[PDB]
Structure formats: C-alpha cells, structure tokens
Design an enzyme around this catalytic site. Structure first.
Site, PDB file in Angstrom:
ATOM      1  N   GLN A   1      34.798  35.694  43.289  1.00  0.00           N
ATOM      2  CA  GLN A   1      35.493  37.235  43.401  1.00  0.00           C
ATOM      3  C   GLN A   1      35.548  37.812  41.732  1.00  0.00           C
ATOM      4  OE1 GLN A   1      39.437  38.404  45.343  1.00  0.00           O
ATOM      5  NE2 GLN A   1      40.068  38.649  43.801  1.00  0.00           N
TER       6      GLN A   1
ATOM      7  N   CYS B   1      39.578  41.130  46.789  1.00  0.00           N
ATOM      8  CA  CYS B   1      39.858  40.899  48.115  1.00  0.00           C
ATOM      9  C   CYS B   1      39.266  40.649  49.327  1.00  0.00           C
ATOM     10  CB  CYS B   1      40.473  40.311  48.050  1.00  0.00           C
ATOM     11  SG  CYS B   1      41.977  40.995  48.626  1.00  0.00           S
TER      12      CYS B   1
ATOM     13  N   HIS C   1      46.455  39.206  50.131  1.00  0.00           N
ATOM     14  CA  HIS C   1      45.620  39.061  49.322  1.00  0.00           C
ATOM     15  C   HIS C   1      44.854  39.734  51.034  1.00  0.00           C
ATOM     16  CE1 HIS C   1      42.074  36.647  48.077  1.00  0.00           C
ATOM     17  NE2 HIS C   1      42.255  35.926  49.157  1.00  0.00           N
TER      18      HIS C   1
ATOM     19  N   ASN D   1      38.238  31.554  51.422  1.00  0.00           N
ATOM     20  CA  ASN D   1      38.610  32.222  50.785  1.00  0.00           C
ATOM     21  C   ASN D   1      37.554  32.987  49.690  1.00  0.00           C
ATOM     22  OD1 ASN D   1      40.680  33.772  48.712  1.00  0.00           O
ATOM     23  ND2 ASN D   1      41.323  31.723  48.500  1.00  0.00           N
TER      24      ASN D   1
END
Ligand SMILES: *CC(=O)[C@H](C)NC(=O)[C@H](CCCNC(N)N)NC(=O)OCc1ccccc1
Length: 215
Positions: free
Chosen positions: A19, A25, A162, A182
């Site tokens: 990102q 996110c 997140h 992630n």
C-alpha cells in the site's frame, strides 16, 4: 476444515502487495478477498485493482481510509459489479495521493453480486472460511509495527484501525492461530504474513468480518 486450512496451499491467494504511504488498507482487504472469491468460484486467479476503489469509490475516502463493506456495495451498486484487473488499472497511489478516477481503458477481471457480513465469533468465522474461502477483517494493528515472526499470542486490542485478509487457521498448533495476509510488502512479518492466537479475539479479529459473494 476443522483442524487446519491454509488457502495459500490451495492456489487461491495472490502475492503480497504494498500500500505504501496511502491509507488504502481497506481497498487491499476488499480486493484481496474478491481475488480469492473469484478463484474459488472456478475462475483463474487474477490480480485485481485496489486503485479502482481508491480513486473511483466515492463512498469511501481514498488515501484517508474507508470500509470494506462500503467498497463491496460500491462495486455492485455503482460499478455494475465490475472489478478491473490490476494490470489495466495499476496502483498509482503509494506516494500517498490518489490520482482522479479514469472510467475507461480498463478490463473487467472479476464481478461480484453482493457481500455477507460474518458473525462476531471466531469459531463461526473459521467454519465459513473453511468452506467458502478467505474473509476480509478489520483489526487493531497498533502492535504490528514490531511484528517480526512467530505467532503473536498477545496483541493490543483496543481500536480497529486496519483492514487485512484472513487466509487460514490451524487449530492443531501448540497455540491455535489465524494466518493473515497484510499489505506492507514481503519485508514485513513472515514474508508479508502474520499469525495471531485464535480463540481470544486478538487484535479484535472477530469484530468486522465480511466477504464478497460472486455468482
Ligand atoms: C489501513 C488504512 O490504510 C487507513 C488509513 N485506515 C482505514 O482504512 C480504516 C480501516 C478500518 C478501520 N475501522 C473500522 N471500524 N473498520 N478506515 C477508516 O477509518 O475509514 C473511515 C470512513 C468511514 C466512512 C466513510 C469513509 C471513511
């Protein structure tokens, strides 16, 4: 399905992305989930576009954040269920700005018909994941800047900040865990991944779990 499920070992998960400086996110969680869902609907795994949401979804707020549920309803209600390929709409944020939305010059890589929101219960989230695939979740990520590997076992769980992808679990481990994709490159965590203890709402992992539905 009980015991352990890792959707990475089933060819259903794309590589870890980055990102960068954008607060996108939410878009990585939403798209990552769609990519997996599309594969599991009997379609070849295709990299899809976060930039389409960051720049075109005006129900969320680009690099200032957003919600995966809003992104899912924007795809259906506003973009005719279309999700563009990453290749035809490459990530252009990263410096932390979202260029304006371009409505053409892109290819439809996937389509969704709606989304479900899963119960706030880890045992039930795992039951659904086992059969239907990766789920998008919101997590408190406060501790995560110091995560170096291993299964975390203790995580600050005060505020959801997140959005990530749950790709599996293993209840056969010494301490059962969740495995989360992630979006902070492969250089963070276990090659971009994190493992947290399952069964104690670590990092508030059960609080906002949802998934796109295709077909
Ligand atoms: C992870 C990030 O990149 C950033 C900067 N934050 C967001 O995307 C958070 C993630 C979800 C956090 N909290 C939840 N309860 N889900 N999003 C955010 O705070 O989005 C806010 C918002 C709300 C309504 C409309 C637009 C934007």
């Amino acid at each position: 399905a009980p015991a352990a499920v890792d959707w990475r070992a089933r060819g259903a998960v794309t590589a870890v992305k980055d990102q960068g400086q954008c607060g996108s996110c939410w878009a990585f969680s939403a798209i990552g989930n769609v990519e997996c869902q599309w594969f599991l609907a009997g379609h070849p795994l295709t990299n899809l576009s976060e930039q389409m949401l960051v720049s075109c979804d005006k129900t969320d707020s680009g690099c200032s954040g957003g919600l995966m549920n809003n992104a899912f309803e924007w795809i259906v209600q506003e973009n005719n269920g279309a999700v563009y390929t990453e290749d035809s709409y490459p990530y252009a944020s990263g410096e932390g700005i979202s260029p304006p939305c371009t409505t053409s010059g892109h290819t439809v890589g996937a389509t969704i018909t709606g989304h479900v929101e899963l119960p706030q219960d880890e045992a039930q989230i795992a039951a659904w994941l086992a059969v239907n695939g990766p789920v998008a979740v919101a997590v408190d990520a406060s501790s995560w800047m110091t995560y170096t590997g291993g299964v975390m076992t203790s995580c600050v769980s005060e505020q959801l900040d997140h959005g990530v992808l749950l790709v599996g679990y293993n209840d056969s481990a010494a301490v059962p865990y969740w495995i989360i994709k992630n979006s902070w490159t492969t250089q963070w965590g276990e090659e971009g991944y994190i493992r947290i203890a399952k069964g104690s709402n670590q990092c508030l992992v059960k609080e906002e779990a949802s998934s796109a539905v295709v077909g």
